[PDB]
């Protein structure tokens, strides 16, 4: 049987006839095979998927939540996975660094000196803000006011620092880019190191990345879940939320999980990192990241019947949820 896979763009749907036919060119007539498909955006993918017109998107952790909502019901079925192949990483926790002894756990924020990644990005406001939601003091809406409402300043690179110049105290400008040195995954994390805010929302790996000596690393606690704070080297069971990295979604009546896996890890054998140079399964003439991204290692089947809540995670969907629905819900008393 065939899969068609969903393409966005005419980049992508090249690679995708181009995936097309080097399959043909390797594999034997009775394999899985791929039909490309071009839908003008994410969503239409997501739709088209679900009227039965194509058979399968790779979609950024956001969108699987979306894929899997009412009508679209879209369920996560291969994974996208990174790093080495023994220990390959496919999600990546959003966690919130703070300083040893800085005495104030999750449940303390309020009035403290936040440091972000970007404004819109997942681990540095989509999640932290999403779950601190029912906190930031209403009126909630726009968003951007109720979080400069809430920290007594922070530096979200790309705020509105203008109707809201308290989000780029720690950061005035709010530079969008890397001129900005408080930026990103590191800036923000150095907004932290300096002293520049009290907390760093980044994803775990960063303090690692940015601190070569555990004994440095030993002068960071991690902000868990609970009102508790656990060391740096225990993210596991002391993070924000639960993120994927890139997913291949189906429908899930109907799907074609069985056959999609199939297609691609036989891709990944032939065509996967580094077993030829004829084509690339993630690596494109004609642009970076079509389809697949280019730093993925290759693919993982996800467990089997397992929805996009559950594959998300409580965190994550509670986040998104607040952040779309904007309602925080009424209380016992």
């Given at each position: 049987k065939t899969v068609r896979w969903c393409a966005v763009s005419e980049h992508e749907a090249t690679k995708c006839q181009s995936f097309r036919d080097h399959m043909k060119s390797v594999i034997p007539s009775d394999g899985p095979s791929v039909a490309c498909v071009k839908k003008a955006s994410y969503l239409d993918c997501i739709r088209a998927i679900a009227a039965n017109e194509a058979d399968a998107v790779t979609l950024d952790a956001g969108l699987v939540y979306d894929a899997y909502l009412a009508p679209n019901n879209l369920k996560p079925v291969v994974a996208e996975f990174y790093g080495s192949k023994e220990d390959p990483q496919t999600f990546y926790y959003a966690v919130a660094v703070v300083k040893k002894d800085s005495g104030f756990q999750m449940n303390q924020l309020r009035g403290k000196k936040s440091c972000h990644t970007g404004l819109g990005r997942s681990a540095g406001w989509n999640?932290?803000?999403?779950?601190?939601?029912?906190?930031?003091?209403?009126?909630?809406?726009?968003?951007?006011?109720?979080?400069?409402?809430?920290?007594?300043?922070?530096?979200?690179?790309?705020?509105?620092?203008?109707?809201?110049?308290?989000?780029?105290?720690?950061?005035?400008?709010?530079?969008?880019?890397?001129?900005?040195?408080?930026?990103?995954?590191?800036?923000?994390?150095?907004?932290?190191?300096?002293?520049?805010?009290?907390?760093?929302?980044?994803?775990?790996?960063?303090?690692?990345?940015?601190?070569?000596?555990?004994?440095?690393?030993?002068?960071?606690?991690?902000?868990?879940?609970?009102?508790?704070?656990?060391?740096?080297?225990?993210?596991?069971?002391?993070?924000?939320?639960?993120?994927?990295?890139?997913?291949?979604?189906?429908?899930?009546?109907?799907?074609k999980e069985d056959l999609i896996w199939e297609l691609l890890n036989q891709a990944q054998e032939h065509f996967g990192k580094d077993k030829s140079k004829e084509f690339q399964l993630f690596s494109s003439p004609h642009g970076?990241?079509?389809?697949?991204?280019?730093?993925?290692?290759?693919?993982?089947?996800?467990?089997?019947?397992?929805?996009?809540k559950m594959y998300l995670g409580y965190e994550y969907v509670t986040a998104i949820r607040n952040l779309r629905e904007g309602t925080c819900p009424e209380a016992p008393t």
């Open positions: 999640i932290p803000i999403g779950l601190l939601y029912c906190d930031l003091p209403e009126p909630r809406k726009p968003l951007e006011k109720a979080v400069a409402n809430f920290f007594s300043g922070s530096c979200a690179p790309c705020a509105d620092g203008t109707d809201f110049p308290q989000l780029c105290q720690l950061c005035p400008g709010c530079g969008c880019s890397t001129l900005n040195q408080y930026f990103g995954y590191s800036g923000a994390f150095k907004c932290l190191k300096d002293g520049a805010g009290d907390v760093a929302f980044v994803k775990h790996s960063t303090i690692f990345e940015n601190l070569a000596n555990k004994a440095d690393r030993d002068q960071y606690e991690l902000l868990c879940l609970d009102n508790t704070r656990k060391p740096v080297d225990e993210y596991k069971d002391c993070h924000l939320a639960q993120v994927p990295s890139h997913t291949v979604v189906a429908r899930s009546m109907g799907g970076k990241d079509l389809l697949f991204k280019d730093s993925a290692h290759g693919f993982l089947k996800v467990p089997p019947r397992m929805d996009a």
